[PDB]
UniProtKB/TrEMBL annotation, chains A, B:
It comes from the Bacteria. Induction: By heat shock. ATP-dependent serine protease that mediates the selective degradation of mutant and abnormal proteins as well as certain short-lived regulatory proteins. Required for cellular homeostasis and for survival from DNA damage and developmental changes induced by stress. Degrades polypeptides processively to yield small peptide fragments that are 5 to 10 amino acids long. Binds to DNA in a double-stranded, site-specific manner. This is Lon protease. It is found in: Cytoplasm. Homohexamer. Organized in a ring with a central cavity. Coiled coil: none annotated.
Amino acid sequence: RYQLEAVKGTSDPAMLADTIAYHATWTVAEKQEILELTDLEARLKKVLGLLSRDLERFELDKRVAQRVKEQM
Amino acid sequence: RYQLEAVKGTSDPAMLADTIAYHATWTVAEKQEILELTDLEARLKKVLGLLSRDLERFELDKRVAQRVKEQM
């Protein structure tokens, strides 16, 4: 994650969405969609919803993991 | 924001009332039934009752949008 922290001076939002949208691997084809999109706010709210479902399933994974340890 | 300039310029409230009733696009028969009523009371109450309904519809569409994004 130093690859984002060295490009903080670039304030181009569609380019940073192409960066962070690349720096998270959910699906290569939807990253091809985002990398080829014209609109910037659409790809920004898309990456927000993707990080939403990602961190939400992370927390569901932690819930199931504690469930398993307690059943142990 | 150039329709708000004709309602913030002068202080005569009848001209402001008719230009707020004109800046809200509606159906022709409702405009004729507003035209049948000579006072400003019932017609501005009708415009209020429809614009508040418009506010409810926009806020309902936004709430449905956020709940659908989280649900999906």
